[PDB]
Amino acid sequence: KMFERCELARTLKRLGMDGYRGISLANWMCLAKWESGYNTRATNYNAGDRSTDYGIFQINSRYWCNDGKTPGAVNACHLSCSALLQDNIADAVACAKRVVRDPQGIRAWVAWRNRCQNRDVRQYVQGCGV
């Protein structure tokens, strides 16, 4: 599923992402936007280390979810990576929350540092009623 901007902003809000661990909704929208273009089916195989990124947040299989084919990987969110390919983003949100409870916070995703940090992200939630 490819979410429409405001539809997604409210979906995230309903799920408790607004200010979760100090992270604003616009920061989460910016992350989803640059990670998958709001596409829940997005996937990226990293031939270099044999891992795969799944879903709207492009969560990596090496540490966060189990796909059974990533060498010596762990499953910190305790979820099948398949859970990250559902149209319903609740499990993906639960996993994204788990990622940010770690030391780096939102900085866990290099794309956020690259395209959201110290950027004006107002545009992501404008007029969404969030």
Torsion over CA: 79, 4, 101, 16 (sign): negative
C-alpha to C-alpha distance for 34 and 58, rounded to whole angstroms:
10
Alpha-helical segments (H) within 37-109: 90-100
Q: What is the set of active-site residues?
A: 35, 53
Q: What domains are there in the chain, each with its CATH number?
A: 1-130 (1.10.530.10)
C-alpha to C-alpha distance for 84 and 61, rounded to whole angstroms:
10
Tally of CB atoms within 10 A around 13: 17
Q: In degrees, to the nearest 5, what angle opens at C-alpha 84 toward C-alphas 40 and 22?
A: 85
H or E segment and range at residue 6: helix 5-14
What token pair was written down for 24? Answer: 């604003």
* 3-state SS assignment for residue 59: strand
CA distances from 11 to 51, 78, 87, 109 (A): 28, 22, 12, 21
Q: Determined by which method?
A: X-ray
Tally of CB atoms within 10 A around 30: 23
Q: If you ran DSSP here, which 8-state letter would residue 40 be given?
A: T
